[PDB]
């Protein structure tokens, strides 16, 4: 419905995606901290940026 994942995550998740928020970070990283690759977990670009940083 939205392939490259423009609608994931939900708007709350952004505001809870900060640096003091490993809780909502770690719900997009692998069991080792890896990001799930964009082919696999298609995230919104803003989500990916906020998440890497």
Binding another protein by CB under 8 A: which of 1, 20, 31, 32? Answer: 20
Q: How big is the site for another protein, counted in residues (CB under 8 A)?
A: 30
CB of 43 to another protein, least distance (A): 10
With binding defined as CB under 8 A, does residue 26 bind another protein?
A: no
Torsion over CA: 48, 42, 30, 35 (sign):
negative
Distances (CA, A) of 42 to 4, 20, 25: 5, 24, 15
First to last CA, the chain: 28
Contacts to another protein by CB under 8 A: 3-4, 6-7, 11-12, 14-16, 18-24, 34-38, 40, 44-50, 52
């Amino acid at each position: 419905k939205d392939p490259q994942g423009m609608q994931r995550p939900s708007p709350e998740v952004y505001m809870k995606l900060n640096y003091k928020n490993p809780a909502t970070i770690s719900r997009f990283l692998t069991r080792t901290g890896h990001m799930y690759p964009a082919d696999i977990l298609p995230l919104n670009p803003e989500a990916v940026a906020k998440l890497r940083v």
